[PDB]
């Protein structure tokens, strides 16, 4: 499969999440995603086919993972925006007030601004600390998907937030949305990963 931020993958033939970003760990191909999407050794599929397995994860506390891919996969420095792409360039972290977009298999490509940092989410499994908050909308299945600026600076991966009864927070105003992502930088350093860029 071609590995693009925002696309669907399944975990052990069960849950669905979204790809964060193509990465390498030395010669090993991978993608970053949310930790809550899978346990270590869980099997990832795209397009019906096995693409790799969860190599490592932290959730709760943090919410991060990377999937270790077979060599047959094609890593791409791209995030889905409809049928277009955003080119991944780097991982410069944007400040509160910056515009940012996110990409995922349920709500697609959604944009807003960064509204707060260092937010705790009190999930049923436990707290996850240190999350960045934006007001782009999101919904169930977008987890793990890319957060990126227009200029291609990868920000992080979708964790969670204030899901409404319809499964998303797109039906409430931006001012009421809490859409939380795990910062990319600590994922890259924790696991020794490099972005694939273009």
């Amino acid at each position: 499969a071609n590995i693009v931020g925002g696309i669907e993958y399944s975990i052990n033939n069960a849950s669905l999440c979204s790809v964060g970003f193509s990465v390498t760990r030395g010669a090993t191909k991978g993608f970053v995603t949310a930790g809550h999407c899978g346990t270590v050794n869980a099997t990832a599929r795209i397009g019906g086919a096995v693409v790799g397995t969860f190599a490592a994860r932290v959730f709760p506390g943090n919410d991060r993972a990377w999937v270790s891919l077979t060599s047959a996969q094609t890593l791409l420095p791209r995030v889905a925006n409809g049928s277009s792409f955003v080119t991944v360039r780097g991982s410069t972290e944007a400040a509160v007030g910056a515009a940012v977009c996110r990409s995922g298999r349920t709500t697609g490509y959604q944009c807003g601004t960064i509204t707060a940092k260092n937010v705790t989410a009190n999930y049923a499994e436990g707290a996850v600390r240190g999350l960045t908050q934006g007001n782009a909308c999101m919904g169930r299945g977008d987890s793990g998907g890319s957060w990126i600026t227009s200029a291609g600076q990868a920000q992080g991966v979708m964790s969670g937030g204030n899901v409404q009864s319809n499964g998303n927070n797109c039906g409430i105003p931006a001012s009421q949305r809490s859409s939380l992502f795990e910062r990319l930088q600590p994922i890259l350093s924790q696991y020794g990963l490099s972005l694939v860029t273009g």
Binding site: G139, G141, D142, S143, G160, G161, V163, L180
Partner: peptide, 4 residues
Amino acid sequence: AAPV
């Protein structure tokens, strides 16, 4: 808040 919920994960996703």
